[PDB]
Amino acid sequence: VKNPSLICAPVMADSIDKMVIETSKAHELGADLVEIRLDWLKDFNPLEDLKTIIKKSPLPTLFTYRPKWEGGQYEGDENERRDVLRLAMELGADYIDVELQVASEFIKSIDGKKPGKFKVIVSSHNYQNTPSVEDLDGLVARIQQTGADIVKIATTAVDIADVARMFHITSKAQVPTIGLVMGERGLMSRILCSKFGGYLTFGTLDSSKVSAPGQPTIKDLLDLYNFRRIGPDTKVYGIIGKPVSHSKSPIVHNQAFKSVDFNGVYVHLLVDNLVSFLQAYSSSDFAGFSCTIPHKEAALQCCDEVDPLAKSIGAVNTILRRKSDGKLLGYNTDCIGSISAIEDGLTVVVIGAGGAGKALAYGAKEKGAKVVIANRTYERELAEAIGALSLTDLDNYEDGMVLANTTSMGMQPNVEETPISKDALKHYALVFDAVYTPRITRLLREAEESGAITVSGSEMFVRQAYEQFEIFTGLPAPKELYWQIMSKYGSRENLYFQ
Ligand SMILES: O=C(O)C1=C[C@@H](O)[C@@H](O)[C@H](O)C1
Description:
It is classed as oxidoreductase, lyase. The protein has 19 helices and 19 strands.
């Protein structure tokens, strides 16, 4: 609905001097406006303080005086609370956010007294779930009926599938609408606003200044997710998994898309149920996906067509939604990424029997010496599917062997977790670890201390990544670019996007 989404920054410092500093920071960061959360001020002299903020703020101002009964900090007299908001408006505020519950009385009180550039936002918060379209429609109608200039609705994501309902609302409501879904599972709703008609989204000054679950930083919205480039025709892609907050696929793919000016956007997709997820997002708006634990093997089942290599491997880590009919095509870029990374580093001991284990096992077989599998659950016929061992026995096992971890052991925040005793490593010439967050896992650490050579999971990550790009865009893999992007933008550790 209308203009691209605005980026609003929540200002919650407990003093006026500090809020002024925050509004400046917001301007510096690239935000379009700021929401002054008046209920967070330790000391508050309405007339004086409000006057200051409006004056010193380099950006348009939206004032909120959130009461305890609506999840805010304000306690006390309701009329006094309302007087402040009225003051804000008459002092030059660009917007005020008034709660649905009291919006009618409030808007009536300012009848024939609203400044020229003043807009009233009426909001509703649902901390339980995301209602049906039917109920959302009714809520929109109710908010409209109060005389609101802008409809504002914040719901909670029980499942990632809930976002689609919110997109339908912001995309089809014929009134300026701010629709957001809270929680990590709703993050996508905060990023794709400009594609689905959202009037505004909230971005933080930093990872610690969050006013609601799921809010990303302004910097990430602008530089990581290329927010300004997102539009109605932009195609959406994302990494499917659980957990998914550690993934850097959104970093690399978005840079690449921008670099070649491809009209696409890549986001994190926290999926609990893969089957329902793919069902909830089958429209042409969602052109492709990457898959990690625990959906690599499951994706294979959901694809309409599977690449011979993927079928032969038994798992899919890349999905493409064919424009032609609209079906899903499964591919596997893990195999070539793992094998090449390893060979470059230069009997293979594969740790893990999941999708990554399958791929790496297959490739190790197809290219030289034979391998043996070692999974937490002994049963995971894998060793006989390509020509076995129980995890606990791995410690008990030549002197120039190769070890390849494809499990999540050691992945952040489980930094002190390793899949094998450092005493065994003494028998390996090379050790690979598919885990790339952190770059140097405990395994790789004690491996280099064990005198062996180490191959980082980033080597495999970048390789399998540019192959997905080619699959997604149909453009030749810009390999050199991906190595550059990973080096310049994907080097920081302990990052969680949620
Ligand atoms: O962390 C990630 O974003 C990924 C990890 C690997 O499993 C890859 O196979 C997947 O395509 C993306």
